[PDB]
Amino acid sequence: VKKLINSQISLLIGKGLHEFDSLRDPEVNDFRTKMRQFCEEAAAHRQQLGWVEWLQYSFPLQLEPNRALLVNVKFEGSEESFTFQVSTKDMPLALMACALRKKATVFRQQPEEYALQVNGRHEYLYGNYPLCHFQYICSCLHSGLTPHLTMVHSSSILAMRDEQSNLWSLEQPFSIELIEGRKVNAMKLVVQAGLFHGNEMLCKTVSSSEVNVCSEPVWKQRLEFDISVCDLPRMARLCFALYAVVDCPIAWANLMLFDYKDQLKTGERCLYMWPSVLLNPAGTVRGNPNTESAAALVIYLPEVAPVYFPALEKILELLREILERELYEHEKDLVWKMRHEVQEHFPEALARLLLVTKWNKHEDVAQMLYLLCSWPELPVLSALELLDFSFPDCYVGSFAIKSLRKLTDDELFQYLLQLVQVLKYESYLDCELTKFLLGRALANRKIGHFLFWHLRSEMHVPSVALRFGLIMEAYCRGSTHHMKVLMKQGEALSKLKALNDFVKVSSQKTTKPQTKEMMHMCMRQETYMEALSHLQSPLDPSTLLEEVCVEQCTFMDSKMKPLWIMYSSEEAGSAGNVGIIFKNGDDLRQDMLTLQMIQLMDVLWKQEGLDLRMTPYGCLPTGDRTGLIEVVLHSDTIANIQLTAAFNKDALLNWLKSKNPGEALDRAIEEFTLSCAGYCVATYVLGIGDRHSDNIMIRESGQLFHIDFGHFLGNRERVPFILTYDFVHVIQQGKTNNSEKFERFRGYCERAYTILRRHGLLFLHLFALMRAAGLPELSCSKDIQYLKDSLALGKTEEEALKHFRVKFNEALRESW
Ligand SMILES: O=C(O)c1cccc(Cn2cc(-c3cccc4c3N=C(N3CCOCC3)CC4=O)nn2)c1
């Protein structure tokens, strides 16, 4: 019935829907019914889209940021195929026209009723684009391969659509009553309490009287805060810390003083606390769900009267440049004084102005909000800064989203990971960000795919399980069919975990050959063959993983026995020969961020016409210390290649010569040189140390790349720029001296470095939002500072390039 759907979502999301119901929370009840309708009406809209708009939803085009080629085309019904020669500048229509036209000759006898499917992939070619804007066509040209496509008629596409259908009054100083608690420690117990608006204190942090450290922490005190109740802003957050002293932190807990209906809360409360690492303003505002084990604090919120935060209508009723290029009190005063100027003449300095406004004075907040309601839209870069925890106000949050609505699907995808982490900072379940993500996800299946996995991957974290579960359920209501596709992915991943556990056990008792044989036998079981085959890759939904082909599957020798799983697809040909690595026991989150950043650098470079031949391979956490990495085929580790050469320095170049005979070598050396420049710069900027020959790989094309990003951000040394002699040797064509090739290489590096600096704030804004994620190596200011320093953002370009040159020369000396 709908019974089945409910049980399908419960399995898919990793939480039973009955668990939601058992909280008997209207916030949650309302979140669920609110969004379910929102998601259900989005499904509505889509089931009536035109066939090209459906393609846009389900198969978003994959593009790049004159000359001729051979393309093979067939039609959906037959085996017969035709090979033409087309231009890289041609449109898909022209290609479809030739295809149609021929079929007519051989078929004894209108392009616009067709789209071209990439054989064996969930990828289509359509739209007004040259064939070498399409990533698959591009891929084939740089690799040499022949594009194989299938003419799909509009009515076949519509068959797919149809088969996937579903107040100011209160001047008294704010106060609470700290009643008692129930905890464990060695001393006397103190409760410190403090009121926050983002990172900023709304007043001084009143503390408890000292009470012995045994059993319950009875207090029955009245805590009064240095602030009027009418001055508490909408997003006011009360923050506790319980600790011992003769310092020993024990626990923390936060809550919103206003509930999700704008009512000021009153009065009693049991706060189930989170274990501590001293106040944690950024911490979640929801209680610890381990209500058996957690220490708890009972408090009382006094009745001040029913009081709601005023509606917007009431709210609305109530040397500049030289500092505007982190400032003093008099500077702040100037900026606040100048707010109208700021809006009219420096609209992009909104963030600055927001941080100087007095959130602990309601009158000031009102005047700021009135400016905000007429404020011009901001660039996306500026909106990314506003998503920071430092901007907690809901109107600000809403303004930020409003400026982000113009994000292209491509941009949104590039920033999605960060936007999901920002949900952790949200105060309430129903929020503009969640609505925006769910809307965009329901309009673009790729976005929906990566949103799903970002959420699913953290369900084992109790602070986000509820929020993320709820979002995934909403999403599933909005696409029943995608829900089935994702279940199939879940079933594969479930089987891989079991397979990997077995491998961990077996390798402890037997040789690797024996274990591998057992792995193979396990995989050939009907249940495994079936679970592991015929699915969309979680790494990239457009890649279909068809028949898992064992004999080629193995596992690595390293601790948590990462699995190496290979696939083939008759229908896709060579493009269907794809591999994934399943890893369980390692935290994949830091490879994802890093690989993501590298992707963004590649994109920023390509946007200036600089293609450094980078390899931004897929990486996707799917669960608790679980996830996938995309295999880059026809590549091996530097270590491995340093394995016939008389001198070890030549092993690399000999290998390249062997894979690139004759005049092919010069292209490979160029690919090596550009990619080396890319990764030299990327690893310097990102502070990725511990680079060695086991975690640097090369492709047979010549392109160098990095794997195993365990320790970025100098993490803390200050990782120098690195040039390896073996790499300089290849760049210089195996010559001792070749300053023509070398100083070109030095040019590539400098160009790459200077382009990144120009987008320095993009990197800082993105890393700022990633502080939400609790990555151990992105936890504080010192980590953000690393980026500031590596991009030398405090300098003029010039100064920065001179600085960079010292470092480059530094690195060169180091490489004998
Ligand atoms: O010794 C073996 O039995 C063995 C079995 C299968 C493969 C290998 C060689 N190997 C190991 C790895 C490897 C080891 C540890 C970490 C990683 C990794 N490869 C990775 N990739 C990613 C992109 O595609 C190339 C492989 C990523 C990665 O993080 N890559 N290749 C060795």
Author numbering: 109 to 173, 187 to 230, 235 to 291, 316 to 335, 339 to 398, 415 to 445, 452 to 479, 482 to 494, ...
Task: Provide passages from the article that reported this PDB entry.
Class I is the most studied and comprises four isoforms, PI3Kα, PI3Kβ, PI3Kδ, and PI3Kγ, that share some structural features but that are distinct for protein domains, regulatory subunits, and activation mechanism. All class I PI3Ks can catalyze the in vivo conversion of phosphatidylinositol 4,5‐bisphosphate (1, PIP2) into phosphatidylinositol 3,4,5‐trisphosphate (2, PIP3). PIP3 production induces the recruitment to the plasma membrane of 3‐phosphoinositide‐dependent protein kinase‐1 (PDK1), which in turn activates protein kinase B (Akt) through phosphorylation on Thr308. Concurrently, the central role of PI3Kγ and PI3Kδ in leukocyte biology sustains their inhibition as a promising therapeutic approach in a variety of inflammatory diseases.
In conclusion, we report herein the discovery of 3‐{[4‐(2‐morpholino‐4‐oxo‐1,4‐dihydroquinolin‐8‐yl)‐1H‐1,2,3‐triazol‐1‐yl]methyl}benzoic acid, a novel, potent pan‐phosphoinositide 3‐kinase (PI3K) inhibitor that bears a strategic carboxylic acid, and the design of its ester prodrugs. Compound 37 emerged from the screening as the most‐potent inhibitor with higher selectivity against PI3Kα (IC50=18 nm) and PI3Kδ (IC50=19 nm) than against PI3Kβ (IC50=59 nm) and PI3Kγ (IC50=186 nm). Compound 37 binds in the ATP binding site in a canonical mode, as described for other type I kinase inhibitors. In detail, the morpholine ring establishes a typical hydrogen bond with Val882 in the hinge region, analogously to 9; the quinolone ring is in a central pocket with an orientation very similar to that of 9, and the carbonyl group is involved in a putative hydrogen‐bonding interaction with Asp911. The 1,2,3‐triazole appears as fundamental to orientate the carboxylic acid group properly. Indeed, the X‐ray structure of 9 shows a perpendicular orientation of the phenyl ring to the central core, whereas 37 is characterized by coplanar orientation of the 1,2,3‐triazole to the quinolinone core. A lipid kinase assay confirmed that 64 was not able to inhibit PI3Kα activity at 100 nm, which confirmed the crucial role played by the carboxyl group in the interaction with PI3Ks.
